[PDB]
Design a protein around this ligand. Structure first.
Ligand SMILES: Cc1cc(-c2cc(NC(=O)c3ccc(C(=O)O)cc3C)[nH]n2)cc(C(F)(F)F)c1
Length: 192
């Protein structure tokens, strides 16, 4: 199992997301969302909010345990290792983004790390605020790299159908989609 840097993704994006068109662009969304969905499936968090921001970036927020805020080796945060070393989905999104921010809430603290220009960290994982102890979760916002994708326009209907399906499969978890470009919004939630 050979590890690689993010440059490897940027030179062969098709090998990781299939293509650099609309399909590839939306694969980025699926990778980020599936991380939140996997957490909910494990029983952590009961809503997942997706937002297409007006500047074209996309946000996904869950309310699960929150990614580990501890240190890996050499003072490098565990979360930074996940976002910068290719083994998988998260580092691929980071590599193919002109910028990305991850915000973790847990243990009464809020932490943030920002990456730019293909996943280069411009900050470390720093505490930016506090919260109630009961508050937990992970939020990731990324801007897809326009120098790589032939289109960086997220399609509301495409994402809506995917989130609907993920909601039907998950059960008892609310998934929302909000389009700040057009004010459109919808929510999905299935019982059992
Ligand atoms: C939207 C989003 C959510 C998440 C994420 C990850 C978590 N949780 C874990 O990574 C997790 C939490 C706790 C424990 C533990 O053993 O206590 C383990 C893991 C893997 N929740 N949400 C991760 C990402 C990711 F992968 F960074 F892109 C994106």
């Amino acid at each position: 199992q050979v590890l690689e840097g993010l440059d490897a993704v940027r030179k062969r994006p098709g090998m990781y997301i299939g293509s650099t068109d609309g399909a590839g662009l939306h694969h980025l969304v699926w990778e980020i969302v599936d991380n939140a969905v996997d957490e909910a499936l494990s029983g952590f968090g009961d809503r997942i909010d997706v937002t297409i921001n007006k500047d074209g970036s996309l946000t996904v927020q869950d309310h699960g345990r929150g990614m580990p805020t501890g240190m890996h080796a050499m003072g490098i945060p565990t979360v930074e290792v996940i976002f910068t070393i290719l083994h998988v989905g998260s580092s691929v999104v980071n590599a193919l983004s002109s910028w990305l921010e991850v915000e973790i809430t847990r243990d009464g603290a809020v932490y943030k790390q920002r990456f730019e220009n293909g996943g280069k960290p411009v900050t470390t994982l720093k505490k930016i605020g506090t919260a109630l102890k009961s508050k937990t979760g992970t939020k990731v916002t990324f801007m897809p790299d326009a120098t790589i994708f032939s289109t960086t326009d997220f399609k509301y209907n495409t994402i809506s159908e995917r989130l609907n399906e993920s909601a039907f499969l998950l059960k008892n978890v609310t998934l929302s989609l909000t389009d700040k470009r057009t004010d459109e919004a919808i929510e999905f939630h299935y019982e059992n």
